[PDB]
Amino acid sequence: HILWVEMAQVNFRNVGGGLVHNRPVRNENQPLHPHHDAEWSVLSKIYYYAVVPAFSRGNCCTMGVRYDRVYQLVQTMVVPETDEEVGTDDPRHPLHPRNLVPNSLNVLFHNACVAVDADAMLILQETVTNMAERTTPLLASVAPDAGMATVATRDMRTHDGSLHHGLLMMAYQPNDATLLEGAFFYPAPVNALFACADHLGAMRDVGAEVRAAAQHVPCVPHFLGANYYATVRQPVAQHAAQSRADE
Amino acid sequence: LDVDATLAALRQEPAEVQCAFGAYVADARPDALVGLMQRFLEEWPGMMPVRPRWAAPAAADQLLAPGNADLRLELHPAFDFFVAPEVDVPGPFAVPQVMGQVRAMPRIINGNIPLALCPVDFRDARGFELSVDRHRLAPATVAAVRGAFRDANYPMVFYIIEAVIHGSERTFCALARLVAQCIQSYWRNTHNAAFVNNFYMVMYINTYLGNGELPEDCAAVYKDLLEHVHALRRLIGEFTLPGDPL
Amino acid sequence: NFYMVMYINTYLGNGELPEDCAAVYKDLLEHVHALRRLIGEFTLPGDPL
Amino acid sequence: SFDPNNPRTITAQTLEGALPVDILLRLNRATAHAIVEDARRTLFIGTSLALVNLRRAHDKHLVERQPMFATSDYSSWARPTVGLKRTFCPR
Amino acid sequence: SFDPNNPRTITAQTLEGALPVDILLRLNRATAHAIVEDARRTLFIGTSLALVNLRRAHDKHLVERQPMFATSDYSSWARPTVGLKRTFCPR
């Protein structure tokens, strides 16, 4: 259990076993206490197992992210020196084409046709005070509880994993070249529900045959629990994908 | 919960090793965590000589054909019986070549009954039974959330902001202004939602911005998506007799 | 033109199009996607012959 | 710049004159097959040169033109390449 | 501030130069693995220092930044601590 980290010691390449508490709390900063009530995780589980597959219908995918390059991009911003904010009409505004240099971060905000002010743009400087090293797989191992607690079930334990500091993207956009395909997110499917097939194409150096044989089988890796040792087998994932019930 | 005799009565047959994918988990040394997918995808076609059974279930009726190789292993409503290599799990990242065995593992959930023995129609009908006069989602809310989830040109800057916030607390009350501007822009752009992929974000939206900088027809979505999860949480509360911690 | 109506909602999409006009091209592509997914369920999965 | 009733008189020497307006207005006041198509060919080249000259003259007052597409990367290891949608850059 | 074709030439001495625009424009005009990542590392630190310097320069003209969260209390017995939502404080 490690606490907040700064630009001082980030060490993206760390591969050890250690997870971060992002500025552990709001106020306290005392040793080793969780900063949310128990039912919080229950509501999270409800949301991710009961409402997401209701709307997505087997499209989402848990994605492993490249925390080095996202930070390498949030830093390079382009803003001039003005006392007062004037608006997007003025050639000093950070969204006007003149001060839009190539491969900056402002060009991305223009790719989405969103409208922002230079102040909120500069606000992004706060993020370097609590980093996020990497995304890592986990692997739980629990035994059956007091219900299925027969002598002949003492060792029939389960195996399920999850991502720490991961990210779930909704629908893959393969047909754009405004960015590299596997730029910031590499596919890391954790469960049979959150495992599409178009996201494997985002992974650099994809095989000529794996993608052909990737539609009819969920591509969950064999270091994140298989379909038989997990608490959420395939039939429930198949259910949410081939029914039509007014969402 | 007595399957001790069934295993002893099933292993008398030598082996029926057909594949090894769906019934083997391996621990990984803390090597690369981004290149593990590289090492796995390259090995994957070597783990599936023939098609894995659990992946594509047999059929609705052809499961009851007088000759298929699945009735031989579906003989209890509360368990699963498959074939897996003769190792102790987890195992090495390279899959071994040992003669198989027949293991067992209880379905912890009723949803894990294969579709051939619990048709999707009955499941939808049970859901629609439970769905009456409990709580719903106004069509405006769901039209927005599905439009969001079904979009194919979702602005990547939102994913960047998600990855950089990573569900903290200080950073969200720091970036509230930018997040509000983004939500407002996207709403007045395509009449959808935003940040719906993450859960901590959809919580922070309605617990911090809420009555404030968001429009009166945009905050309704983010309040509906939370009150619905709240009703879902309350659901299991009235399907449990008051008992004692066991 | 097919490539045209695809590039429309790929690049233009959320951008210069009004809040309403882009829905036409979005629907015209989601329909083709649904028709593509149709045949995806009428073939029992097997091995390439 | 030339006379229309004779196709044999058009060439790079006379078409260098000015913008495509001169070409079109010359062709407007008119009053074997190898001659006319050879003439069509150099006329095409001449009008292309006229059009690029017009664009030079008008582009002396416009914004710089960025590369539209990402992924062409030489110093990639430092920055991630990001293209630009030429939705509007008018001046 | 440096030449792109050589990664061994970037360091805190040369990156102190100016705002991230100089870094990005330098990387824009380009034309074993340990060298390039060590270079990536100090380049990251350099651009962070550049960004905090830019924020200093622009923040010399902005409003004071209050504590956002309540409940951190030293003289609590007198006043009840109340945070501030940074919804908009632009100038």
DSSP codes of every residue in B37-75: HHHHHHHGGGT-SS--TTTS---SSGGGSTT-SSGGG--
What would the two tokens of residue C40 be? 């995806």
The answer to whether the CB of B172 falls within 8 A of the CB of B179 is: yes
A65 φ, ψ (degrees, to nearest 5): -115, 155
Q: Is the CB of E88 less than 8 angstroms away from the CB of B177? A: yes
A114 vs C: CB within 8 A = no
CB pairs under 8 A between A and B: 286
Within 8 A by CB and 6+ apart from A175, the residues are C6, C10
A104 vs B: CB within 8 A = no
Q: Please give, rounded to a whole number of angstroms, the shortest distance from the CA of A176 to a CA of chain C.
A: 7
Nearest C-alpha in D relative to C12: D87
Within 8 A by CB and 6+ apart from A108, the residues are A73, B156, B157, B160, D82
Burial class of A147 by CB neighbour count within 10 A (0 to 12, 13 to 18, 19+): exposed
The answer to whether the CB of A210 falls within 8 A of the CB of B190 is: no
A116 vs B: CB within 8 A = yes
Q: Please give, rounded to a whole number of angstroms, the shortest distance from the CA of A170 to a CA of chain B.
A: 6
Query: d(Cα D2, Cα D4) in Å, to the nearest integer?
Result: 7
Tokens 């629609």 belong to B128
Straight-line distance from the first to the last Cα atom of chain B, in angstroms, rounded to the nearest whole number: 18
CB pairs under 8 A between A and E: 61
E30 vs D: CB within 8 A = yes
> What are the distances in angstroms from CA A183 to CA A68, A69, A194, B238, D37?
11, 8, 20, 47, 51
Nearest C-alpha in E relative to A117: E90
D64 vs E: CB within 8 A = no
Mutate to test the interface with E, among B164, B168, B170, B177 (most CBs of E within 10 A): B177
Residue type, C2: F
Within 8 A by CB and 6+ apart from E81, the residues are E70, E71, E72, E73
B132 φ, ψ (degrees, to nearest 5): -75, 135
E and C in touch (3+ CB pairs within 8 angstroms): no
Query: d(Cα E19, Cα E12) in Å, to the nearest integer?
Result: 13
Count CB neighbours of B5 within 10 A: 9
The answer to whether the CB of A160 falls within 8 A of the CB of A225 is: yes
Tokens 């469960």 belong to A191
- SS3 label, residue B224: helix
Straight-line distance from the first to the last Cα atom of chain A, in angstroms, rounded to the nearest whole number: 40
Nearest C-alpha in A relative to C3: A175
Point out the residue among A113, A176, A216 whose CB comes nearest to the CB of C15: A113
Q: Please give, rounded to a whole number of angstroms, the shortest distance from the CA of A149 to a CA of chain D.
A: 54
The answer to whether the CB of B153 falls within 8 A of the CB of A109 is: no
Query: d(Cα B66, Cα B71) in Å, to the nearest integer?
Result: 9
Q: Please give, rounded to a whole number of angstroms, the shortest distance from the CA of A207 to a CA of chain E.
A: 25
Tell me, in Å, the resolution of the deposited structure. Answer: 4.4
DSSP state at residue A50? I
Q: Please give, rounded to a whole number of angstroms, the shortest distance from the CA of A100 to a CA of chain C.
A: 18
Count CB neighbours of E4 within 10 A: 16
Query: d(Cα C34, Cα C27) in Å, to the nearest integer?
Result: 10
Nearest alpha carbon to residue E57 among E49, E69, E46? E49
Q: Is the CB of B56 less than 8 angstroms away from the CB of C47? A: no
Query: d(Cα C33, Cα D69) in Å, to the nearest integer?
Result: 26
Query: d(Cα B28, Cα B38) in Å, to the nearest integer?
Result: 13
The answer to whether the CB of A60 falls within 8 A of the CB of A85 is: no
Burial class of A191 by CB neighbour count within 10 A (0 to 12, 13 to 18, 19+): buried
Q: Please give, rounded to a whole number of angstroms, the shortest distance from the CA of A92 to a CA of chain D.
A: 15
Tokens 């090492």 belong to B39
Residue type, A156: M
Is there a cis peptide before residue B90, judged by omega within 30 degrees of 0?
yes
Q: Is the CB of A159 less than 8 angstroms away from the CB of B111? A: no
- Considering only CB atoms, which chain B residues are within 8 Å of E68? 170, 173-174
The answer to whether the CB of D79 falls within 8 A of the CB of E27 is: yes
Burial class of A134 by CB neighbour count within 10 A (0 to 12, 13 to 18, 19+): buried
- Considering only CB atoms, which chain D residues are within 8 Å of C12? 87
- SS3 label, residue C3: helix
Q: CA gyration radius for chain A?
A: 22
* Type and span of the H or E element at A186: strand A185-187
Nearest C-alpha in D relative to E41: D78
Alpha helices in B191-244 (DSSP H): 199-204, 219-237
Helix B170-190, helix B156-165: angle, nearest 10: 170
Q: What's the maximum distance between 2 C-alpha atoms anywhere in chain E?
A: 65
Q: Please give, rounded to a whole number of angstroms, the shortest distance from the CA of A90 to a CA of chain D.
A: 13
Nearest C-alpha in B relative to C45: B56
A143 φ, ψ (degrees, to nearest 5): -95, 160
Point out the residue among A113, A175, A242 whose CB comes nearest to the CB of C10: A175
**Phi/psi zone of residue A11: left (φ > 0), alpha (ψ -120 to 50 degrees), beta?**
left
Q: Is the CB of A103 less than 8 angstroms away from the CB of D89? A: no
- Considering only CB atoms, which chain B residues are within 8 Å of A17? 30
The answer to whether the CB of B91 falls within 8 A of the CB of B27 is: yes
* Type and span of the H or E element at A168: strand A167-169
- Considering only CB atoms, which chain A residues are within 8 Å of D87? 113
The answer to whether the CB of B231 falls within 8 A of the CB of B133 is: no
B240 vs C: CB within 8 A = no
Nearest C-alpha in C relative to B155: C14
Count CB neighbours of D4 within 10 A: 13
| Residues of E within an 8 Å Cβ radius of A | 20-21, 23-25, 28, 40, 44-45, 47-48, 50-52, 54-55, 57-59, 61-62, 69-72, 90-91
Alpha helices in chain D (DSSP H): 12-15, 20-28, 33-59
Nearest alpha carbon to residue A23 among B165, B8, B148? B165
Q: Is the CB of D78 less than 8 angstroms away from the CB of E31? A: no
* Type and span of the H or E element at B103: strand B100-105
Which chains would you list as touching D if contact means 3+ CB atom pairs under 8 Å?
A: A, C, E
B107 vs C: CB within 8 A = no
Residue type, B10: L
